């Protein structure tokens, strides 16, 4: 190992799984299921055969409100989804024993395509999956129905939209959890370009599994960005363990203690008492008023304790009102209170508080943003906190009783339908702990 830190693994039901596990067993660099998550995200594309069929039938291609008169094609695509899946599989498969997967979603109206991992091994980036699926779909549809050479350009427009004129996938009927590299805010942000609702639809609205998935991708993205190098690796590893993976049952214990009659303030008092009890923080100096100013014994661990309390604070506040709008305010004042309660730095040293400031603004102003669900780690408003703000947001959309316009249903209809079927994607907490147990003795 590298670090002496030992963590007790707990599941989505607050039940002990294993004690004294090395902290690095949950590292993206060592956990096999985190390696699986990334690999599968990078290679899985959602296909809307019903959408592609409707687009051709009507001539409605290449963006919204766009209709080309005199270039319509009536093809029974959905009816013959089984032949299209057999053709797509055959065009992408390298060997009969490889991981290539082509499956039908919602009775062949939709489709799930997974490129063989080897294609990505010889690929420089993730967009290969969209591009190879787009081509395989075109070749399949054109050959199956003997589409005329002069009608064939409309098939491309039905699948990829307005590309290549637009550098992005405008009006495309195929989607990936990852947005195009052109739309990245910063370098390495690729894994951060996942909508909050996508995490919520994939998890099937389960809080612990939503927090885990968002935290896993967000903290794995920190490693890509070079934000978890040297002194910071431990800060991000403990952040992933306590905030997203419910280490030492911290997240659940705080929710259990403040579920009935607790407020954000009580959650703050609970995490401070817990942190002080485990010796992660000690009293530095007593001020004239009798106010005890605390200092961290373990900087990276105090931040992780605070980060876990932040998730508990949103579960308790957003869960009391059964609304996801409170999240921006909960993330803001959990950090604001924790600082003027102890004198210690908040989650991500003010970065999570700052992220929430802008998040409150854009989820309530005329300049931009929107509902809490449309945001992501690659969004100019929510990209400032380094993997600590997006996971608590996911916990809020989960408890919301449909008080949003851009709710999971309207934004993650196609995307959610695919990955919710994959075992490791819907329940990530359950499998990262199994993945940690499989490597815990080999490190």
């Amino acid at each position: 190992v590298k670090y002496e830190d030992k963590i007790c693994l707990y599941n989505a039901k607050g039940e002990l799984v294993e004690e004294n596990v090395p902290l690095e067993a949950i590292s993206p660099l060592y956990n096999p299921t985190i390696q699986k998550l990334v690999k599968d995200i990078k290679r899985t594309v959602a296909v809307n055969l019903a959408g592609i069929e409707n687009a051709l039938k009507t001539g409605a291609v290449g963006g919204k409100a766009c209709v080309i008169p005199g270039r319509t094609l009536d093809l029974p695509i959905v009816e013959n989804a089984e032949t299209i899946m057999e053709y797509v599989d055959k065009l992408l498969r390298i060997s009969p024993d490889d991981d290539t997967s082509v499956k039908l979603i919602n009775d062949g109206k939709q489709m799930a395509v997974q490129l063989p991992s080897k294609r990505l091994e010889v690929a420089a980036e993730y967009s290969i999956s969209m591009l190879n699926t787009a081509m395989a779909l075109k070749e399949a549809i054109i050959k199956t129905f003997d589409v005329d050479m002069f009608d064939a350009p409309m098939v491309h427009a039905a699948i990829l939209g307005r590309y290549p004129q637009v550098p992005d996938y405008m009006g495309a009927n195929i989607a990936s959890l990852l947005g195009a590299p052109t739309n990245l805010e910063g370098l390495g942000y690729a894994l951060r370009n996942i909508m909050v609702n996508h995490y919520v639809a994939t998890t099937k609205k389960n809080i612990m599994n939503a927090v885990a998935f968002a935290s896993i991708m967000e903290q794995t993205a920190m490693f890509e960005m070079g934000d978890a190098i040297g002194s910071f690796e431990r800060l991000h590893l403990l952040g992933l363990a306590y905030q997203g993976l419910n280490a030492d049952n911290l997240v659940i214990d705080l929710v259990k203690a403040n579920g009935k009659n607790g407020t954000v303030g009580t959650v703050v008092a609970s995490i401070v008492e817990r942190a002080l009890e485990d010796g992660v923080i000690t009293e530095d100096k007593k001020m004239p008023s009798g106010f005890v100013l605390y200092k961290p014994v373990d900087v990276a661990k105090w931040n992780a304790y605070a980060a876990a309390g932040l998730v508990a604070a949103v579960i308790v506040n957003c869960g009391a009102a059964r609304a996801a709008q409170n999240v921006a305010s909960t993330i803001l004042y959990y950090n604001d209170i924790i600082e003027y309660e102890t004198g210690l730095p908040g989650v991500d040293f003010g970065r999570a508080e700052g992220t929430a400031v802008g998040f409150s603004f854009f989820s309530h102003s005329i300049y931009g943003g929107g509902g809490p669900g449309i945001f992501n780690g690659n969004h100019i408003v929510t990209r400032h906190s380094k993997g600590f703000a997006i996971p608590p947001v996911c916990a809020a959309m989960c408890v919301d009783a449909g008080t949003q316009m851009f709710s999971p249903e309207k934004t993650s209809a196609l995307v959610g339908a695919v990955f919710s079927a994959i075992d490791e994607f819907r329940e990530p907490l359950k499998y990262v702990i199994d993945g940690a147990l499989a490597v815990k003795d080999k490190i």
Binding site: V255, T330, G343, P345
Partner: protein, 258 residues
């Protein structure tokens, strides 16, 4: 563990602490019957049915979530009542409650709250049924409010940083509330958005500056300067430095420079 709430060695830092502490019953100064309060909010009328957005929680087949069910929802969420607002513009001239002050009190005393702090305004979004309940007992009837220095506003909130009027009221470009020369009390003739109400609602007598100075949560050179609160300045300087060193190097050795 006994919580500290807020650092500081002045009365202002103590008033901020008393506002945050859920065990400190704030001094009742007026009685504003529930029927009249909802009217100033201008959302619905008394002796009427609560408009709903989503059906009650019991009427929903939601997927299983062990953690979600631990959080006991408020009555407003239980029967699927709509979520509405109530905003306050607080005068910088010794108003009993202040923007960030309000926000940390709400997050300490009330459950499932959506608060929003701005310089000129403070917005609180909550379940209509539970909102109206605290908006009267806590937000208006106690020392947390003053009819002249706390303007109930929806739009055109301008006035917080403006010099007061002839009779001690804050600037209000929409004339929601007027000073009554007869009663010596402030009467809201319009709601927070600026719609005229058929029956004007009286809020009560204006408090003199002398007592507002003893309850206010704002530091002023006229009252208690922030220069005097040497303790608050110490903690702010620390929060600043801990953030600076935390961004540079998150180690225990780096933090020896505090």
């Amino acid at each position: 563990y006994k919580p500290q709430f807020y650092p500081g060695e002045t009365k202002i830092a103590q008033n901020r602490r008393n506002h945050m502490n859920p065990e400190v019953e704030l001094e009742k100064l007026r009685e504003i019957p529930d029927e009249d309060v909802v009217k100033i909010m201008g959302h619905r009328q008394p002796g009427e049915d609560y408009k709903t957005i989503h059906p009650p929680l019991e009427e929903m087949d939601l997927p299983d979530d062990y953690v979600r069910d631990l959080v006991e929802p408020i009555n407003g969420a239980k029967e699927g009542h709509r979520i509405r607002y109530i905003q306050f513009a607080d005068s910088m001239y010794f108003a009993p409650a202040q923007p960030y002050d309000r926000a940390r009190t709400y997050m300490w005393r009330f459950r499932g709250v959506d608060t929003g702090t701005l310089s000129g305004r403070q917005v609180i979004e909550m379940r209509e049924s539970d909102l109206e309940a605290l908006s009267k007992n806590f937000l208006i009837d106690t020392a947390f409010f003053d009819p002249a220095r706390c303007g109930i506003r929806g739009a055109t909130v301008h006035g917080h940083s403006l010099r007061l009027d002839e009779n001690g009221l804050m600037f209000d470009a929409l004339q929601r509330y007027v000073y009554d020369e007869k009663t010596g009390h402030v009467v809201y003739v319009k709601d927070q958005v600026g719609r005229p109400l058929d029956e004007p609602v009286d809020v009560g007598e204006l408090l003199p500056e002398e007592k507002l100075r003893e309850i206010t949560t704002i530091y002023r050179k006229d009252g208690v300067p922030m220069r005097e609160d040497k303790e608050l300045l110490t903690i702010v300087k620390r929060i600043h430095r801990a953030r600076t060193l935390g961004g540079f190097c998150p180690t225990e050795d780096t933090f020896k420079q505090l």
